[PDB]
Amino acid sequence: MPMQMFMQVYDEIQMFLLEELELKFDMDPNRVRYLRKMMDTTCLGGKYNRGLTVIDVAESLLSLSGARRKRVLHDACVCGWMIEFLQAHYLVEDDIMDNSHPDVTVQCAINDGLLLKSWTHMMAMHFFADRPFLQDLLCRFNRVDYTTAVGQLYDVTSMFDSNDFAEFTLSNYKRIVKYKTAYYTYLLPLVMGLIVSEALPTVDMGVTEELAMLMGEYFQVQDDVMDCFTPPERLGKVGTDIQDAKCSWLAVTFLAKASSAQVAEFKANYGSGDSEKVATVRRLYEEADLQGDYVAYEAAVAEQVKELIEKLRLCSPGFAASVETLWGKT
Amino acid sequence: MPMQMFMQVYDEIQMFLLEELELKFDMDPNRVRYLRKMMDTTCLGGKYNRGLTVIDVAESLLSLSGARRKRVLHDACVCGWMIEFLQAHYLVEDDIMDNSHPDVTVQCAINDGLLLKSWTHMMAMHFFADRPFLQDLLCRFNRVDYTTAVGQLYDVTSMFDSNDFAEFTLSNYKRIVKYKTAYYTYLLPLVMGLIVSEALPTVDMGVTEELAMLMGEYFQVQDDVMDCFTPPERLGKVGTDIQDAKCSWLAVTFLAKASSAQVAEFKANYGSGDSEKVATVRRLYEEADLQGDYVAYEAAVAEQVKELIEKLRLCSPGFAASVETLWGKT
Ligand SMILES: NCc1ccc(F)c(Cl)c1
Ligand SMILES: NCc1ccc(F)c(Cl)c1
Ligand code: NA
Ligand code: NA
């Protein structure tokens, strides 16, 4: 029922956006079908964890606050696709970076990125045109998107001086995770699920803001370890954090417990494409017993999570049930 | 006074955005100064025609509807910088297309483009937080930005089949100009000048929508001719429409009046980087007496402009005065 309803609303949103282009933006059929295919390619195929979280939060709040049910659930589905389209927009922006007479494919990728973001506004301004929360919804949505771009700046420049390992600290690693990932992947679906369910001012946002960061941190640490040791056919991609000199959880944890000569060996091999230097970095990670620290670090975060949901249920009980399922996915 | 006040408000907007990053987004001073420099580089230096138009419209409406004056003028200045930042965002997006281990400059250019657009939202959500028109302002702003991305799709793909000279028509040329340029360069500053001056529903939008398209068309035709014949040291850039196979006013006008063998000569030489093929295209344009048609075409548009402002002044007199100055700039 959740996934089945989420995909129906996708068809409704897609048909509106495409008919609008045809009827109000003078778009020819060839370009309409081209945009239908681009939308399907960039927005479908993932796991929809951000989008379904909006729905799951919405259904947990109409059970403990007829016509209001069907509307809030439809509003939740539109908000879920707003985040999925936003995620599609961020992924297209990422493809432009690593993919490289006018090059029409790079022009169309940039254009795709702009269209995907504008579509989040267009579907909100339509399906929520008569909702009182539309203005508060756009502001929080626009501010989270801004937060994510700030976090991408922190991430992309963590090894240089904005016109280097000084910013390879655990507090800065959390700053990157917080802004680049946590706010839009964990906080935004929760907040949107509370807005369409009218229960936004009925929750402790501090505990909510704190769980979102901790779940994002838990998720990103596991992602960093898998990027380095999970083989490509099992990970789904080629792990490239060592080559890209990323400020990963492995790197900042290694630097805190490495010897002076080992740090020199790490600094001399990090951020290179050579297969032996990357393997030297993985050798240092293994010999530093970083795996054993990974298990303990996640445990303490999980304890902070499994105990922070309790503060949230003292004043917002139904909310805490959905946050547990979101944590279960992580 | 106009330009002097516009630059003061820029300092006020810049200080808010940068202090917000420092105080609310945990940004370090090195990155704050880097963003101040990026903002100055991308947003300053132009002619500010879009931004000053918001001011000029606002002052013409408080003269024919104390504290309300100073506030509307400040609101107009913030709206002017919203369009300038939007223009800066579009220009960065254009630089990414023709400019081409993680390439940190392409990463930072993409990031710059995202920040510049988000800044238009951030400055609106702050300085207009208590304005009743904030929601209507964002919607029209978001819809014009969407329109511009649709127009970039029409422009970038005018020579292919979205997965060719069939779309090289005068009606399609106007569609490109309308969406890609007219809406955000001519209609948007006028609309924003009416919103902050509370005189949005007091004007005939049809005549206004029609003047904006015609002025954009007038401006783009002159721009197309200069791209082809104005030398680089006098134009300010290297003209590249022939090489890029653009759907320019010269190309669509030539194809309507060329002979069968000339069209074959045009089609065989258009869209190439070779110096002799580009010169062959300019030879065809000259021999087709396109310059003589350019003067007449602009005259008829000017007549349509010099006469459409009159319909606007029958119900909105002060508006028409500013539209004339905007037309004078063109
Ligand atoms: N060195 C092999 C390895 C496997 C799994 C892990 F989690 C880590 Cl850190 C390291
Ligand atoms: N062929 C030279 C030339 C100069 C000015 C123009 F406007 C045109 Cl169309 C052509
Ligand atoms: Na998702
Ligand atoms: Na301008």
Side-chain angles (χ1 to χ4, degrees):
Chain A
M1 192 70 66
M3 175 75 68
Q4 201 165 6
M5 173 180 292
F6 195 49
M7 294 301 301
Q8 295 178 225
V9 177
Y10 175 85
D11 293 334
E12 182 181 18
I13 293 175
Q14 173 170 88
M15 191 57 63
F16 162 74
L17 293 173
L18 296 179
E19 286 186 343
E20 178 183 52
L21 284 166
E22 175 195 14
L23 301 177
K24 300 173 186 174
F25 289 80
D26 208 9
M27 188 165 286
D28 53 295
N30 288 327
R31 289 188 175 82
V32 174
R33 298 194 306 273
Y34 158 79
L35 287 184
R36 177 182 282 107
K37 180 185 176 187
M38 184 277 292
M39 196 191 301
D40 287 354
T41 294
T42 51
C43 294
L44 303 182
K47 214 175 186 181
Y48 312 132
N49 291 124
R50 297 172 188 79
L52 296 172
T53 300
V54 186
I55 299 173
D56 194 71
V57 170
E59 62 84 67
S60 291
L61 270 49
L62 43 84
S63 304
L64 186 63
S65 298
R68 278 172 290 179
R69 167 186 170 84
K70 181 179 175 181
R71 180 182 68 196
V72 169
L73 294 178
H74 188 272
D75 294 355
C77 291
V78 178
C79 281
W81 283 115
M82 288 174 65
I83 313 185
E84 297 299 326
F85 276 54
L86 187 63
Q87 168 69 1
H89 153 74
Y90 293 143
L91 290 178
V92 172
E93 296 300 306
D94 294 337
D95 293 305
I96 302 163
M97 316 194 190
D98 57 68
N99 273 20
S100 294
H101 40 72
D103 198 6
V104 72
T105 178
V106 178
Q107 291 172 326
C108 283
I110 285 153
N111 186 248
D112 292 350
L114 304 179
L115 290 175
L116 287 163
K117 184 53 167 51
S118 296
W119 280 340
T120 73
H121 304 143
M122 299 305 297
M123 68 176 75
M125 282 159 41
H126 177 78
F127 295 100
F128 303 148
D130 289 357
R131 302 290 191 278
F133 59 81
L134 175 60
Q135 175 169 341
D136 183 64
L137 184 86
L138 292 179
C139 291
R140 298 174 185 271
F141 191 87
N142 288 336
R143 189 177 179 86
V144 165
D145 175 54
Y146 182 49
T147 297
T148 312
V150 173
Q152 291 179 180
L153 179 59
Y154 295 153
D155 187 31
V156 158
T157 59
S158 69
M159 347 75 178
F160 312 107
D161 160 58
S162 297
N163 297 328
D164 199 339
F165 293 97
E167 298 192 345
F168 273 56
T169 70
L170 200 56
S171 49
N172 181 47
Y173 172 81
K174 295 182 186 178
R175 184 182 67 161
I176 299 168
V177 176
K178 172 175 184 176
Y179 291 79
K180 177 196 177 180
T181 302
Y183 264 95
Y184 93 96
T185 301
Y186 288 90
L187 185 61
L188 183 59
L190 298 181
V191 169
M192 297 189 98
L194 304 173
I195 289 181
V196 303
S197 297
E198 223 71 287
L200 178 61
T202 75
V203 302
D204 198 319
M205 192 57 62
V207 180
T208 303
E209 279 181 319
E210 200 174 343
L211 270 169
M213 310 316 152
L214 287 172
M215 290 189 294
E217 169 175 342
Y218 185 96
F219 168 76
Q220 192 61 58
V221 170
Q222 177 172 16
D223 244 69
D224 292 350
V225 174
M226 293 170 54
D227 182 288
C228 184
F229 307 100
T230 299
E233 66 275 5
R234 190 144 58 95
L235 178 64
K237 64 176 181 177
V238 185
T240 173
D241 289 341
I242 297 169
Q243 295 89 337
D244 303 338
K246 300 295 280 194
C247 180
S248 72
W249 180 89
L250 294 171
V252 306
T253 306
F254 171 86
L255 289 170
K257 59 188 302 187
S259 71
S260 62
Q262 281 172 336
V263 164
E265 188 181 353
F266 172 84
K267 292 187 173 185
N269 290 271
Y270 203 60
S272 171
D274 171 57
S275 306
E276 262 58 62
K277 296 186 180 179
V278 167
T280 297
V281 172
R282 296 199 195 94
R283 183 178 178 176
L284 293 170
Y285 289 165
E286 152 73 15
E287 295 174 347
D289 194 8
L290 291 194
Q291 176 188 359
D293 299 324
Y294 163 77
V295 184
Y297 192 88
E298 299 294 67
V301 177
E303 293 174 342
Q304 295 180 84
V305 167
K306 284 184 172 58
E307 297 171 5
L308 257 183
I309 306 185
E310 292 306 312
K311 279 189 173 184
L312 184 67
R313 80 165 71 261
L314 260 55
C315 297
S316 304
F319 194 16
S322 63
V323 182
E324 165 63 40
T325 300
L326 172 57
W327 167 250
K329 303 190 182 65
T330 318
Chain B
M1 192 70 66
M3 175 75 68
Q4 201 165 6
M5 173 180 292
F6 195 49
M7 294 301 301
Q8 295 178 225
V9 177
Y10 175 85
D11 293 334
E12 182 181 18
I13 293 175
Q14 173 170 88
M15 191 57 63
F16 162 74
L17 293 173
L18 296 179
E19 286 186 343
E20 178 183 52
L21 284 166
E22 175 195 14
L23 301 177
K24 300 173 186 174
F25 289 80
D26 208 9
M27 188 165 286
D28 53 295
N30 288 327
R31 289 188 175 82
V32 174
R33 298 194 306 273
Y34 158 79
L35 287 184
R36 177 182 282 107
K37 180 185 176 187
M38 184 277 292
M39 196 191 301
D40 287 354
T41 294
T42 51
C43 294
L44 303 182
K47 214 175 186 181
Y48 312 132
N49 291 124
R50 297 172 188 79
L52 296 172
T53 300
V54 186
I55 299 173
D56 194 71
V57 170
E59 62 84 67
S60 291
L61 270 49
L62 43 84
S63 304
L64 186 63
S65 298
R68 278 172 290 179
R69 167 186 170 84
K70 181 179 175 181
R71 180 182 68 196
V72 169
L73 294 178
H74 188 272
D75 294 355
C77 291
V78 178
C79 281
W81 283 115
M82 288 174 65
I83 313 185
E84 297 299 326
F85 276 54
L86 187 63
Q87 168 69 1
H89 153 74
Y90 293 143
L91 290 178
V92 172
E93 296 300 306
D94 294 337
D95 293 305
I96 302 163
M97 316 194 190
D98 57 68
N99 273 20
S100 294
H101 40 72
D103 198 6
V104 72
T105 178
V106 178
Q107 291 172 326
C108 283
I110 285 153
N111 186 248
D112 292 350
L114 304 179
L115 290 175
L116 287 163
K117 184 53 167 51
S118 296
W119 280 340
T120 73
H121 304 143
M122 299 305 297
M123 68 176 75
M125 282 159 41
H126 177 78
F127 295 100
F128 303 148
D130 289 357
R131 302 290 191 278
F133 59 81
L134 175 60
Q135 175 169 341
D136 183 64
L137 184 86
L138 292 179
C139 291
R140 298 174 185 271
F141 191 87
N142 288 336
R143 189 177 179 86
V144 165
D145 175 54
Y146 182 49
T147 297
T148 312
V150 173
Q152 291 179 180
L153 179 59
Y154 295 153
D155 187 31
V156 158
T157 59
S158 69
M159 347 75 178
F160 312 107
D161 160 58
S162 297
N163 297 328
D164 199 339
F165 293 97
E167 298 192 345
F168 273 56
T169 70
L170 200 56
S171 49
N172 181 47
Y173 172 81
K174 295 182 186 178
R175 184 182 67 161
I176 299 168
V177 176
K178 172 175 184 176
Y179 291 79
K180 177 196 177 180
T181 302
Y183 264 95
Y184 93 96
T185 301
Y186 288 90
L187 185 61
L188 183 59
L190 298 181
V191 169
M192 297 189 98
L194 304 173
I195 289 181
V196 303
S197 297
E198 223 71 287
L200 178 61
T202 75
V203 302
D204 198 319
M205 192 57 62
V207 180
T208 303
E209 279 181 319
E210 200 174 343
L211 270 169
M213 310 316 152
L214 287 172
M215 290 189 294
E217 169 175 342
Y218 185 96
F219 168 76
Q220 192 61 58
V221 170
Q222 177 172 16
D223 244 69
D224 292 350
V225 174
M226 293 170 54
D227 182 288
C228 184
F229 307 100
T230 299
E233 66 275 5
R234 190 144 58 95
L235 178 64
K237 64 176 181 177
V238 185
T240 173
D241 289 341
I242 297 169
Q243 295 89 337
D244 303 338
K246 300 295 280 194
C247 180
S248 72
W249 180 89
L250 294 171
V252 306
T253 306
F254 171 86
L255 289 170
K257 59 188 302 187
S259 71
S260 62
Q262 281 172 336
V263 164
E265 188 181 353
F266 172 84
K267 292 187 173 185
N269 290 271
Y270 203 60
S272 171
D274 171 57
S275 306
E276 262 58 62
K277 296 186 180 179
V278 167
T280 297
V281 172
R282 296 199 195 94
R283 183 178 178 176
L284 293 170
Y285 289 165
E286 152 73 15
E287 295 174 347
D289 194 8
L290 291 194
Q291 176 188 359
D293 299 324
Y294 163 77
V295 184
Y297 192 88
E298 299 294 67
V301 177
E303 293 174 342
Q304 295 180 84
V305 167
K306 284 184 172 58
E307 297 171 5
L308 257 183
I309 306 185
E310 292 306 312
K311 279 189 173 184
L312 184 67
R313 80 165 71 261
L314 260 55
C315 297
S316 304
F319 194 16
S322 63
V323 182
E324 165 63 40
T325 300
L326 172 57
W327 167 250
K329 303 190 182 65
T330 318

